[PDB]
Amino acid sequence: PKTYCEELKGTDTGQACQIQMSDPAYNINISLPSYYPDQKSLENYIAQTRDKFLSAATSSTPREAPYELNITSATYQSAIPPRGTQAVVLKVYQNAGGTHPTTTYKAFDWDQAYRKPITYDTLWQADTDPLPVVFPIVQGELSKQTGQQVSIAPNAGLDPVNYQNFAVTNDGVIFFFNPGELLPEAAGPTQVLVPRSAIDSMLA
């Protein structure tokens, strides 16, 4: 019931897998729920994520004192005749030394039926169009709320800021970016949901 994190210097907290280690000028605390297929994706990514953030503070960032990475993901799953798909969105925000403001939440899509994640080869399709697909309920409930559906701004609400990252479920693929008011630069990244039957075949 583990992945990288286990050997990644892992610490146990229960329904989490944690890697907390800090160097003489920075810090890393990162968590993975028991089973995230190829978390190797984030945690390979952290090698990538945090190095990039510390990567800048290796020169001149308001580093509180040294540097740190807080990161942790949640998985989701698609529903297709045989199983479906899996995507896990990490809470990873880090700052150089406390003070360099740096935040992002990252999720990824992996194939559920074949135990296989997808890459930019066929993960990005540049057949890329709007992502209001989560938005329907938000207004749809609104439609409950005022008996009608309104206008919600995408960085004002395209997608649940309750999410935070590329979270593709059987209902869609919610993609996140960090803007100003769908969870500002302080709350993390915004997100826009892409068509489930539409964008997957529209992957790559």
| Beta-sheet pairing, 16-23 with 68-77 | unpaired
CATH architecture of structural domain 1-118: 2-Layer Sandwich (3.30)
* 3-state secondary structure at position 71: strand
Question: What is the phi/psi pair of residue 142, to 5°?
Answer: -55, -50
CB count within 10 Å of CB 146 equals 9
Tokens 């135990």 map to which residue? Answer: 115
**Type of residue numbered 57:** A
If you write DSSP's letter for every residue of 145-167 in order, what string do you get? HTSS-----STTTTS-TTT-S-E
Cα gap 160→193, rounded to integer Å:
9
* Angle, CA of 40, 37 and 166, to the nearest 5°: 80
Cα gap 162→186, rounded to integer Å:
14
Cα gap 32→16, rounded to integer Å:
6
Method of elucidation:
NMR
* CB contact at 8 A, 145 and 154: no
Domain ranges within the chain, ordered by starting residue: 1-118, 119-204
Identify the CATH class of 119-204.
alpha beta
If you write DSSP's letter for every residue of 89-143 in order, what string do you get? EEEEEEEBTTTB--EEEE--EEETTTTEE--TTTS--S-----BTSHHHHHHHHH
DSSP state of 10: -
Tokens 């990567």 map to which residue? Answer: 55
**What residues contact residue 180 under an 8 Å CB cut-off, 6+ apart?**
155, 190
Length of the chain: 204
| Token reading at 188 | 């993390």
| Token reading at 2 | 């583990």
Residue from 45, 107, 49 nearest 75 by CA = 107
* CB contact at 8 A, 63 and 45: no
> H or E segment at 72?
strand 68-77
